[PDB]
Amino acid sequence: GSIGAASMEFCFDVFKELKVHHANENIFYCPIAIMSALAMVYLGAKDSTRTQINKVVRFDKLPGFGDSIEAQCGTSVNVHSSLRDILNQITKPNDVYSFSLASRLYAEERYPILPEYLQCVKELYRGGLEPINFQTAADQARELINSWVESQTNGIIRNVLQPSSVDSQTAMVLVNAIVFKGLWEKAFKDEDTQAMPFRVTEQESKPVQMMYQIGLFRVASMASEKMKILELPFASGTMSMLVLLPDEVSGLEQLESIINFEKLTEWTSSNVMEERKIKVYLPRMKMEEKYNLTSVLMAMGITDVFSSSANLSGISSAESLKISQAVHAAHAEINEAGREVVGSAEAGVDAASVSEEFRADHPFLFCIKHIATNAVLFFGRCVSP
Amino acid sequence: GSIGAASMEFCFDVFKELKVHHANENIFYCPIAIMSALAMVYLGAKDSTRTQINKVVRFDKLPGFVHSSLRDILNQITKPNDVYSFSLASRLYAEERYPILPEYLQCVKELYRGGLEPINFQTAADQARELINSWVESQTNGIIRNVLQPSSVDSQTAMVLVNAIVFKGLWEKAFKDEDTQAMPFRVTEQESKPVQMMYQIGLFRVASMASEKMKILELPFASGTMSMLVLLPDEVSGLEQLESIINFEKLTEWTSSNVMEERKIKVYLPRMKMEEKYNLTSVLMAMGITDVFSSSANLSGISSAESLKISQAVHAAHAEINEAGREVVGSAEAGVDAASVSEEFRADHPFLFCIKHIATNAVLFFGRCVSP
Ligand SMILES: *[C@@H]1O[C@H](CO)[C@@H](O)[C@H](O)[C@H]1NC(C)=O
Ligand SMILES: *[C@@H]1O[C@H](CO)[C@@H](O)[C@H](O)[C@H]1NC(C)=O
C-alpha cells in the first residue's frame, strides 16, 4: 500500500513470531532495516523465491517495487523509492540524531555475480554485495565480516557472526546491523534521574536509573484496555517514541495479544490523543538484541531462499547460491539528552500543580516512528532496561 | 590557491604552535574540521576580526570565498559510505538573548550542519554546559564526553565554539588479528612500552630519504579516497629535527611519485587510539587571531548585539587505527612473500602521521605518536 502501513504490518508479523521464542525478555529490532536487507535479495530473486518474499514482506504495491520498474534498476531513480527515501532521509548526516546502517550480502567468491546486479545493488543500496572466500578461509571470512560491522557501527556492534556460523560450505551471508541515537525535543535533566525500583513482576524488582521531567506531551488514556500511551518527540520533529504502558505490572500479555496496525492507528489517532502537562518517569535504557533471521522468516513463510530450491538467477547463474545465514542486530540507547529544558521555577510550580503522571516502572512496549509516513523504525518490549 | 595547499599550510602553522605547549605528548587534530568552524565565524565577521582570520587561515585565496572548495570535501567525507565513518559535531552556541541576523541563520543552515544554536548562559550556565556536553556525546555515539569542564561557562559567556570529530576507516589491505602481538615501543631509548603491534607484508608506496634520515610509508584506505602517510625517523630520537623541518613544501617533495615507489615490505604499525582535546583559544591567539575572543570582536554579520564574542573554543578529535580492512592476503601469496620479502618498515619508535584526501590533497588529520 504505503510504506507506513507495510512496515507496521511487517513489524507485527515479526513480533508475533518473536514473542513465541522470547518470553520474559527484552525484544528490540528495526523493521525498516530488515525490509531493506530483503529488498536487496528480492532484486535478483525469481519464481517462488520472489513470491514468498513479496507476500511476507509486503512489497506488493509499494511505489518502486514492480518488476517493470525494477527492470530499470541501473538507470532509474524511481526503483524502490518508497523504501529508499526513508533510508536516505534517516542515514543522512544531521545535527539531532545519528543512524549507522551496516547492511551487506557476502557471497562466496567462487560464485560468479551478474555484472548488472552488482551495479544495480550498488546504485540503490550501500553495503550491497561483497565477494569473499568462505571456501578456503571461513574463520578469516568471519573476521572480515565482523570487523566491517564493528567499523561501520563505531565499535558498537561486535561479533555479529559467532564462531562456526560460517564454514567451507557457506554460500552467502546476510548481515544487517543498526545503531540509533537521537536527542529529545525536551531533555530530561541529569540531576533529576534517580535510582527507583523497576517491577519486572509482582514479586520482583531491580533498581534502575529512572529519568524524570514534567512537560506538555501527547497522552491517551484507553480505560477500556487499561493502559496509557505517551508520545515523546525527537528533536527536529521527524520521529517520535510511543510508549504503551499497561496499568498492571503484568498487563503486558494482554496488550501483546491484541496490538496490531489497525489498533495502533486507532489508539494514536488525533481523535484520542491530547496534549497535557504530565510528570514523566522513563528508565534510561540500553537496548541491544541480535536475531537469527533464518528461523524467523522461515516461520513466516520465506523458505526457498535458505535452501537448495532458491532461485537467485538475478544474482548468479551458479545453481547453488542460497542464503546460508541471515543476522539482524539493533542497538539503541535512550537517555536524558535533548534540545531544550524547562526553567527550574517553572518546574517547581508544575511539581506543585501537576498530579497526572506516566510512571514507566514496569514492562512496556515502545515504538519509534517516522512521523510523516507513520513508518516503524524501531519496535520493542522493555522488561529489563 | 587550492584547499590542499591551504589545508596543509594551516595544518603546519597549527603544528608549530602545539608542539611548544605539548612537548613529549601525542598530538592529534583535524585541520579540515577546524577550518570549517572558522568559516562559520568568518561569514559574520567584519573589519579587523575578519581580516585576522583571513590572514591566518588564508581564506580569500580559495574558490567560493558558497565555500565550495571547503564544503565539497566536507560533504563528501560526511556522507554515509561502506568503507569509512566520519562523525562531525560542529556548532556555535550563542546566548539566547542575542538576536541572530536572519541573513546569517538562513545561510549557515544551508552551508553548515550544526551551525548556530541559542542557549541560556545568562541564568543557567551549569545547565547549558550539560546540554552542550550531552549534544557532543549524543552525536559521537558516546565517544567524546565532557567537552566543557566545570566553570568554563558562566553568566558572562557569549558564544561557545565546539568542534568534535570521530573517524574510523577500513584499510584496503587488512592486517590479520592473529599477527598482532606485544612488541616494545621505544618511547625513548631508555623507556620501552608494550604495545599491540600490527604486522603484514604487502605492496605499498614507500620512500626512503637518506638525506633526511627518514622513511615514508603510504597506507591506502579502502576504495582509495584517503591514505595515511607514516613519517618515521631513522633514529629513535630523530623526531625533533624532522618536526623542525616539516612544512607543506617539504611534504609535497617527500611524497612525489618520482620519489615514492611500490615495494613489497614487512609493515609493523601499532594499534592506535588517538584522542586529544585542545583549547582553540590559546592556539588561535598565538597564531594571530585575537579580535574574535575579545571586547573588540566585530561579529556584526551574526548579531547586532555589541557584546558578541567567542568565549570558549574547543577542538576534539578521536580516531581508532586497528587491523580492520577489506582484503587479506591468501595463504599461497603469504607463503611467497615470507620467502622473498626482506625489507621492513617497523614503526616502533615515535613518528608523525597524516591522513590525506587523495583527490584534493587536503589534510584530514595530522598527528605525532609518542605513546600508542
Ligand atoms: C539460524 O537458524 C537456523 C534455524 O532455522 C539454523 O539452521 C542456523 O544454525 C541458525 N544460525 C545460527 C547462527 O544459529
Ligand atoms: C582557553 O585559553 C583561553 C586563553 O588563554 C583561557 O582564557 C580560557 O580559560 C581557556 N579555556 C578553558 C576552558 O580552559
mmCIF file of N, CA and C in Angstrom, chain A residues 154-234:
data_model
loop_
_atom_site.group_PDB
_atom_site.id
_atom_site.type_symbol
_atom_site.label_atom_id
_atom_site.label_comp_id
_atom_site.label_asym_id
_atom_site.label_seq_id
_atom_site.Cartn_x
_atom_site.Cartn_y
_atom_site.Cartn_z
ATOM 1 N N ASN A 154 30.678 2.162 14.747
ATOM 2 C CA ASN A 154 31.505 2.851 15.735
ATOM 3 C C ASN A 154 31.979 2.023 16.888
ATOM 4 N N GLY A 155 32.214 0.763 16.540
ATOM 5 C CA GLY A 155 32.737 -0.192 17.514
ATOM 6 C C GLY A 155 31.572 -0.738 18.331
ATOM 7 N N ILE A 156 30.333 -0.393 17.980
ATOM 8 C CA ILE A 156 29.250 -0.791 18.962
ATOM 9 C C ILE A 156 28.810 -2.232 18.788
ATOM 10 N N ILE A 157 28.630 -2.617 17.537
ATOM 11 C CA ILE A 157 28.111 -3.982 17.291
ATOM 12 C C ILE A 157 29.368 -4.830 16.970
ATOM 13 N N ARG A 158 29.753 -5.687 17.847
ATOM 14 C CA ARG A 158 30.841 -6.660 17.837
ATOM 15 C C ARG A 158 30.344 -8.099 17.730
ATOM 16 N N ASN A 159 31.182 -8.911 17.091
ATOM 17 C CA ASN A 159 30.926 -10.323 16.895
ATOM 18 C C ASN A 159 29.505 -10.619 16.493
ATOM 19 N N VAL A 160 29.122 -9.934 15.412
ATOM 20 C CA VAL A 160 27.837 -10.257 14.795
ATOM 21 C C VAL A 160 27.733 -11.698 14.367
ATOM 22 N N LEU A 161 28.700 -12.258 13.628
ATOM 23 C CA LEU A 161 28.714 -13.702 13.336
ATOM 24 C C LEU A 161 29.523 -14.437 14.405
ATOM 25 N N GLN A 162 28.896 -15.389 15.058
ATOM 26 C CA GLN A 162 29.543 -16.213 16.080
ATOM 27 C C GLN A 162 30.381 -17.282 15.367
ATOM 28 N N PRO A 163 31.339 -17.830 16.084
ATOM 29 C CA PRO A 163 32.187 -18.875 15.528
ATOM 30 C C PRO A 163 31.370 -20.132 15.185
ATOM 31 N N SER A 164 31.857 -20.704 14.118
ATOM 32 C CA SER A 164 31.318 -21.745 13.255
ATOM 33 C C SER A 164 29.876 -21.515 12.878
ATOM 34 N N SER A 165 29.647 -20.251 12.488
ATOM 35 C CA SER A 165 28.400 -19.926 11.772
ATOM 36 C C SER A 165 28.723 -19.716 10.295
ATOM 37 N N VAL A 166 30.006 -19.693 9.959
ATOM 38 C CA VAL A 166 30.471 -19.856 8.555
ATOM 39 C C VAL A 166 31.515 -21.018 8.514
ATOM 40 N N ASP A 167 31.548 -21.615 7.350
ATOM 41 C CA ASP A 167 32.432 -22.777 7.082
ATOM 42 C C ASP A 167 32.571 -22.890 5.564
ATOM 43 N N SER A 168 33.295 -23.924 5.143
ATOM 44 C CA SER A 168 33.677 -24.037 3.714
ATOM 45 C C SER A 168 32.419 -24.063 2.863
ATOM 46 N N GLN A 169 31.342 -24.433 3.552
ATOM 47 C CA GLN A 169 30.116 -24.712 2.744
ATOM 48 C C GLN A 169 29.300 -23.448 2.582
ATOM 49 N N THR A 170 29.560 -22.458 3.437
ATOM 50 C CA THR A 170 28.702 -21.210 3.366
ATOM 51 C C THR A 170 28.662 -20.680 1.958
ATOM 52 N N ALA A 171 27.481 -20.392 1.468
ATOM 53 C CA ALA A 171 27.292 -19.750 0.182
ATOM 54 C C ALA A 171 27.257 -18.232 0.274
ATOM 55 N N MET A 172 26.271 -17.748 1.050
ATOM 56 C CA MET A 172 26.004 -16.276 1.141
ATOM 57 C C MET A 172 25.505 -15.918 2.529
ATOM 58 N N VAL A 173 26.045 -14.869 3.115
ATOM 59 C CA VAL A 173 25.652 -14.407 4.471
ATOM 60 C C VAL A 173 24.997 -13.022 4.349
ATOM 61 N N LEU A 174 23.792 -12.925 4.952
ATOM 62 C CA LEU A 174 23.152 -11.593 5.062
ATOM 63 C C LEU A 174 23.450 -10.952 6.399
ATOM 64 N N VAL A 175 24.049 -9.734 6.394
ATOM 65 C CA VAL A 175 24.301 -9.049 7.679
ATOM 66 C C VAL A 175 23.551 -7.714 7.676
ATOM 67 N N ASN A 176 22.875 -7.472 8.845
ATOM 68 C CA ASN A 176 22.015 -6.254 8.850
ATOM 69 C C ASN A 176 22.003 -5.664 10.316
ATOM 70 N N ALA A 177 22.793 -4.640 10.474
ATOM 71 C CA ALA A 177 23.107 -4.123 11.830
ATOM 72 C C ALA A 177 22.826 -2.628 11.822
ATOM 73 N N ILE A 178 22.215 -2.169 12.964
ATOM 74 C CA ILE A 178 21.832 -0.772 13.064
ATOM 75 C C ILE A 178 22.007 -0.239 14.486
ATOM 76 N N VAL A 179 22.598 0.940 14.569
ATOM 77 C CA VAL A 179 22.712 1.776 15.760
ATOM 78 C C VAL A 179 21.894 3.077 15.574
ATOM 79 N N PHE A 180 21.217 3.453 16.676
ATOM 80 C CA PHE A 180 20.480 4.753 16.654
ATOM 81 C C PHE A 180 20.773 5.515 17.956
ATOM 82 N N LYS A 181 20.895 6.818 17.809
ATOM 83 C CA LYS A 181 20.954 7.734 18.980
ATOM 84 C C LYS A 181 20.274 9.014 18.523
ATOM 85 N N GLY A 182 19.320 9.537 19.327
ATOM 86 C CA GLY A 182 18.689 10.788 18.893
ATOM 87 C C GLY A 182 18.594 11.692 20.155
ATOM 88 N N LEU A 183 18.401 12.973 19.913
ATOM 89 C CA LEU A 183 18.092 13.887 21.045
ATOM 90 C C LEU A 183 16.544 14.013 21.128
ATOM 91 N N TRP A 184 16.034 14.004 22.361
ATOM 92 C CA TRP A 184 14.704 14.510 22.638
ATOM 93 C C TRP A 184 14.562 15.954 22.237
ATOM 94 N N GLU A 185 13.321 16.287 21.959
ATOM 95 C CA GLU A 185 12.905 17.729 21.893
ATOM 96 C C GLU A 185 13.092 18.428 23.248
ATOM 97 N N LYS A 186 12.542 17.809 24.277
ATOM 98 C CA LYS A 186 12.632 18.218 25.692
ATOM 99 C C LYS A 186 13.523 17.260 26.480
ATOM 100 N N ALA A 187 14.674 17.794 26.863
ATOM 101 C CA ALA A 187 15.647 16.971 27.602
ATOM 102 C C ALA A 187 15.127 16.679 28.992
ATOM 103 N N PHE A 188 15.466 15.553 29.532
ATOM 104 C CA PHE A 188 15.431 15.329 30.995
ATOM 105 C C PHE A 188 16.701 15.930 31.594
ATOM 106 N N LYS A 189 16.656 16.471 32.810
ATOM 107 C CA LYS A 189 17.911 16.961 33.422
ATOM 108 C C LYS A 189 18.640 15.838 34.138
ATOM 109 N N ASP A 190 19.981 15.811 34.011
ATOM 110 C CA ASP A 190 20.637 14.639 34.682
ATOM 111 C C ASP A 190 20.313 14.665 36.187
ATOM 112 N N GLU A 191 20.135 15.903 36.693
ATOM 113 C CA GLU A 191 20.086 15.954 38.195
ATOM 114 C C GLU A 191 18.844 15.262 38.656
ATOM 115 N N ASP A 192 17.855 15.125 37.771
ATOM 116 C CA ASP A 192 16.524 14.568 38.111
ATOM 117 C C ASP A 192 16.401 13.100 37.974
ATOM 118 N N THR A 193 17.447 12.435 37.517
ATOM 119 C CA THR A 193 17.480 10.985 37.315
ATOM 120 C C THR A 193 17.825 10.326 38.649
ATOM 121 N N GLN A 194 17.109 9.295 39.054
ATOM 122 C CA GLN A 194 17.271 8.747 40.429
ATOM 123 C C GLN A 194 17.123 7.245 40.315
ATOM 124 N N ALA A 195 17.755 6.508 41.203
ATOM 125 C CA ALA A 195 17.536 5.052 41.309
ATOM 126 C C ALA A 195 16.109 4.801 41.778
ATOM 127 N N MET A 196 15.292 4.016 41.132
ATOM 128 C CA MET A 196 13.934 3.605 41.565
ATOM 129 C C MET A 196 13.761 2.177 41.126
ATOM 130 N N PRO A 197 12.886 1.471 41.826
ATOM 131 C CA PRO A 197 12.636 0.074 41.506
ATOM 132 C C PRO A 197 11.859 -0.033 40.195
ATOM 133 N N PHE A 198 12.283 -1.028 39.426
ATOM 134 C CA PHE A 198 11.545 -1.394 38.207
ATOM 135 C C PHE A 198 10.922 -2.745 38.568
ATOM 136 N N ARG A 199 9.629 -2.799 38.449
ATOM 137 C CA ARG A 199 8.844 -4.008 38.819
ATOM 138 C C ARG A 199 8.674 -4.926 37.634
ATOM 139 N N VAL A 200 9.592 -5.877 37.550
ATOM 140 C CA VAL A 200 9.660 -6.829 36.443
ATOM 141 C C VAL A 200 8.391 -7.699 36.563
ATOM 142 N N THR A 201 8.210 -8.196 37.760
ATOM 143 C CA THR A 201 6.972 -8.858 38.184
ATOM 144 C C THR A 201 6.413 -8.235 39.455
ATOM 145 N N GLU A 202 5.228 -8.718 39.805
ATOM 146 C CA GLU A 202 4.595 -8.535 41.106
ATOM 147 C C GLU A 202 5.505 -8.856 42.275
ATOM 148 N N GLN A 203 6.361 -9.844 42.079
ATOM 149 C CA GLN A 203 7.229 -10.376 43.147
ATOM 150 C C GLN A 203 8.709 -10.126 42.908
ATOM 151 N N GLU A 204 9.047 -9.055 42.197
ATOM 152 C CA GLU A 204 10.448 -8.881 41.771
ATOM 153 C C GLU A 204 10.665 -7.498 41.173
ATOM 154 N N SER A 205 11.718 -6.883 41.645
ATOM 155 C CA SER A 205 12.131 -5.518 41.410
ATOM 156 C C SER A 205 13.666 -5.485 41.286
ATOM 157 N N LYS A 206 14.069 -4.496 40.518
ATOM 158 C CA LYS A 206 15.526 -4.295 40.200
ATOM 159 C C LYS A 206 15.642 -2.755 40.150
ATOM 160 N N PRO A 207 16.671 -2.211 40.728
ATOM 161 C CA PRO A 207 16.846 -0.747 40.788
ATOM 162 C C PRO A 207 17.340 -0.294 39.408
ATOM 163 N N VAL A 208 16.774 0.785 38.900
ATOM 164 C CA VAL A 208 17.159 1.341 37.597
ATOM 165 C C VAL A 208 17.317 2.850 37.735
ATOM 166 N N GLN A 209 18.051 3.397 36.800
ATOM 167 C CA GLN A 209 18.157 4.902 36.762
ATOM 168 C C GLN A 209 16.926 5.413 36.065
ATOM 169 N N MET A 210 16.113 6.107 36.777
ATOM 170 C CA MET A 210 14.751 6.483 36.260
ATOM 171 C C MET A 210 14.867 7.963 35.910
ATOM 172 N N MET A 211 14.617 8.328 34.647
ATOM 173 C CA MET A 211 14.662 9.692 34.291
ATOM 174 C C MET A 211 13.307 10.342 34.656
ATOM 175 N N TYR A 212 13.313 11.656 34.800
ATOM 176 C CA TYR A 212 12.047 12.372 35.233
ATOM 177 C C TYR A 212 11.977 13.744 34.624
ATOM 178 N N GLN A 213 10.806 14.135 34.141
ATOM 179 C CA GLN A 213 10.544 15.544 33.817
ATOM 180 C C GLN A 213 9.032 15.790 33.898
ATOM 181 N N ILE A 214 8.660 17.035 34.020
ATOM 182 C CA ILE A 214 7.273 17.485 33.822
ATOM 183 C C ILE A 214 7.215 18.302 32.538
ATOM 184 N N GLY A 215 6.237 18.008 31.689
ATOM 185 C CA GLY A 215 6.215 18.706 30.394
ATOM 186 C C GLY A 215 4.839 18.428 29.796
ATOM 187 N N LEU A 216 4.577 19.164 28.754
ATOM 188 C CA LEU A 216 3.471 19.094 27.841
ATOM 189 C C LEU A 216 3.696 18.017 26.811
ATOM 190 N N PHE A 217 2.928 16.935 26.909
ATOM 191 C CA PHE A 217 3.184 15.774 25.985
ATOM 192 C C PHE A 217 1.834 15.284 25.500
ATOM 193 N N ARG A 218 1.789 14.682 24.328
ATOM 194 C CA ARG A 218 0.568 13.965 23.930
ATOM 195 C C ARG A 218 0.471 12.608 24.610
ATOM 196 N N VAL A 219 -0.712 12.390 25.186
ATOM 197 C CA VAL A 219 -1.072 11.239 26.000
ATOM 198 C C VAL A 219 -2.513 10.817 25.590
ATOM 199 N N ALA A 220 -2.735 9.529 25.616
ATOM 200 C CA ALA A 220 -4.092 8.968 25.506
ATOM 201 C C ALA A 220 -4.282 7.995 26.669
ATOM 202 N N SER A 221 -5.499 8.016 27.204
ATOM 203 C CA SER A 221 -5.811 7.010 28.269
ATOM 204 C C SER A 221 -6.867 6.095 27.690
ATOM 205 N N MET A 222 -6.603 4.831 27.690
ATOM 206 C CA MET A 222 -7.506 3.880 26.986
ATOM 207 C C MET A 222 -8.073 3.076 28.184
ATOM 208 N N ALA A 223 -9.099 3.613 28.859
ATOM 209 C CA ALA A 223 -9.600 2.971 30.109
ATOM 210 C C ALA A 223 -10.091 1.544 29.845
ATOM 211 N N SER A 224 -10.670 1.358 28.667
ATOM 212 C CA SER A 224 -11.116 0.049 28.220
ATOM 213 C C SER A 224 -9.992 -0.955 28.106
ATOM 214 N N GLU A 225 -8.783 -0.489 27.827
ATOM 215 C CA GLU A 225 -7.716 -1.526 27.593
ATOM 216 C C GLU A 225 -6.828 -1.471 28.805
ATOM 217 N N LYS A 226 -7.213 -0.584 29.739
ATOM 218 C CA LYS A 226 -6.434 -0.447 30.963
ATOM 219 C C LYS A 226 -4.958 -0.093 30.599
ATOM 220 N N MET A 227 -4.774 1.023 29.911
ATOM 221 C CA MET A 227 -3.373 1.347 29.529
ATOM 222 C C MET A 227 -3.359 2.812 29.213
ATOM 223 N N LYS A 228 -2.141 3.337 29.132
ATOM 224 C CA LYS A 228 -1.914 4.708 28.663
ATOM 225 C C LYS A 228 -0.764 4.692 27.609
ATOM 226 N N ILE A 229 -0.859 5.609 26.693
ATOM 227 C CA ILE A 229 0.195 5.760 25.672
ATOM 228 C C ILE A 229 0.734 7.184 25.801
ATOM 229 N N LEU A 230 2.041 7.302 25.850
ATOM 230 C CA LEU A 230 2.758 8.573 25.792
ATOM 231 C C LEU A 230 3.539 8.718 24.472
ATOM 232 N N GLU A 231 3.528 9.937 23.947
ATOM 233 C CA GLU A 231 4.374 10.261 22.798
ATOM 234 C C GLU A 231 5.454 11.253 23.239
ATOM 235 N N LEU A 232 6.714 10.871 23.052
ATOM 236 C CA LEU A 232 7.865 11.780 23.234
ATOM 237 C C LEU A 232 8.531 12.041 21.882
ATOM 238 N N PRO A 233 8.434 13.259 21.436
ATOM 239 C CA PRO A 233 9.063 13.708 20.171
ATOM 240 C C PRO A 233 10.587 13.813 20.272
ATOM 241 N N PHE A 234 11.220 13.432 19.138
ATOM 242 C CA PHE A 234 12.698 13.610 18.984
ATOM 243 C C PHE A 234 12.903 15.007 18.460
#
